[PDB]
């Protein structure tokens, strides 16, 4: 419906990985990890003596290549810390500027998936359990503390995400499976203080905050989740409040919104979701490359646009969690960010559009034309 130029969002290409000598075989969800807009980590398994490329997106996409002997490697959201795992069992986390081994241990059961829950905490998911590690606590040989057990709805799925709230007492683990020819998503929600889990359908999940009128300067906590039904194709975005403070007068009213899928994208599904707390914007990215911008307080879709033709396989927050970055199958890392300085021109054009539409309606059956 619209072009990139006319929409009030700025589009950037942070790096072309393939123009840096990165082979297309390593541009997949398990080989190229994306934890923040600071580093890209490419695990190159090529002849036994595997290597890792760390692309520093901040310092002019500088490539630091080192030979590594593991089957997975990820970078810290902002520091120069690398976590490496081998056989799913031996885990070793290093600071690269102090040359110091922050952590080193061996789990009993292998780790299927891991991700940084916060600047301080790294989450692990095994075939049966969900664990968490404070890698900066000083205890080098300390194995991760068990968080909870995997809900049965996650069985026979591949875990693709692990998200937490800022207080680290609400968690969501996202797995997907193949169903009715499409991709179905399952989410385990977990409240730590209640020690209770809940099973929902969904491809994407995130926790965020929003200041509501009347609550002063105190935010309210909301959980955002996106799903597309593998059977019906219906897609839904849901925003629901968690742990409301009774001293606050205004609470977030649960919102549900339809997610749009064009007729050619029947096998598309949501792959990522990021939220700008500052601007109250939900960015929902799909695998085919469609970005949706929703307004956080009302859940209303502001606009939909196609930012890439190649499929995306991973995403992350961009700027200071004000936008969304993603890596497509080609290796382009693309960033999308709302730009308030472009909203006024966008509004002026929409006002012209509605004036013209009114005029043609008066050409039809609307009272007018004098």
């Amino acid at each position: 419906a619209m072009a990139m130029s006319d929409l009030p969002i700025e589009f950037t290409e942070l790096v072309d990985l393939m123009s840096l000598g990165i082979s297309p075989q390593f541009l997949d969800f398990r080989s190229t990890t994306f934890e923040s807009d600071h580093f890209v980590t490419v695990r190159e398994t090529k002849d036994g003596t595997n290597s890792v490329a760390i692309v520093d997106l901040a310092k002019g996409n500088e490539v630091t290549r080192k030979n590594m002997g593991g089957d997975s490697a990820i970078m810290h959201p902002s520091q120069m810390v690398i976590s490496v795992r081998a056989n799913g069992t031996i885990v070793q986390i290093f600071n690269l500027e102090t040359k110091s081994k922050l952590k080193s241990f061996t789990l009993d059961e292998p780790v299927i998936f891991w991700r940084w829950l916060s600047e301080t905490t790294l989450g692990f998911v095994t075939a049966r359990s969900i664990l968490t590690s404070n890698v900066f606590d000083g205890n080098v040989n300390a194995k991760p503390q068990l968080l909870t057990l995997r809900h049965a709805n996650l069985n026979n799925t591949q875990i693709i995400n692990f998200v937490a709230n800022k207080n680290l007492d609400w968690f969501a683990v996202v797995g997907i499976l193949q169903e009715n020819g499409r991709i179905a998503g399952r989410i385990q929600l977990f409240s730590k203080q209640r020690n209770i889990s809940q099973a929902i359908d969904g491809h994407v999940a995130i926790f965020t905050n929003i200041l509501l009128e009347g609550n002063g300067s105190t935010p309210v906590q909301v959980f955002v989740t996106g799903n597309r039904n593998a059977t019906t194709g219906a897609g839904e975005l849901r925003i629901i409040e968690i742990d409301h403070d009774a001293s606050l007068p205004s609470q977030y009213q649960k919102e549900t919104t339809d997610i749009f899928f064009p007729p050619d994208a029947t096998n598309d599904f949501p792959i990522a979701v990021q939220v700008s707390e500052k601007y109250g914007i939900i960015y929902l990215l799909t695998k085919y490359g469609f970005i949706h911008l929703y307004e956080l307080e009302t859940g209303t879709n502001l606009f939909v646009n196609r930012i890439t033709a190649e499929s995306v396989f991973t995403a992350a927050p961009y700027n200071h969690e004000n936008g969304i970055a993603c890596i497509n199958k080609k290796g382009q890392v693309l960033a999308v960010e709302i730009s308030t300085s472009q909203i006024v021109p966008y509004i002026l054009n929409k006002l012209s559009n509605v004036a013209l539409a009114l005029i043609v309606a008066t050409r039809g059956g609307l009272p007018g034309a004098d």
Partner: peptide
């Protein structure tokens, strides 16, 4: 060590 998995890295050096």
């Amino acid at each position: 060590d998995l890295l050096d």
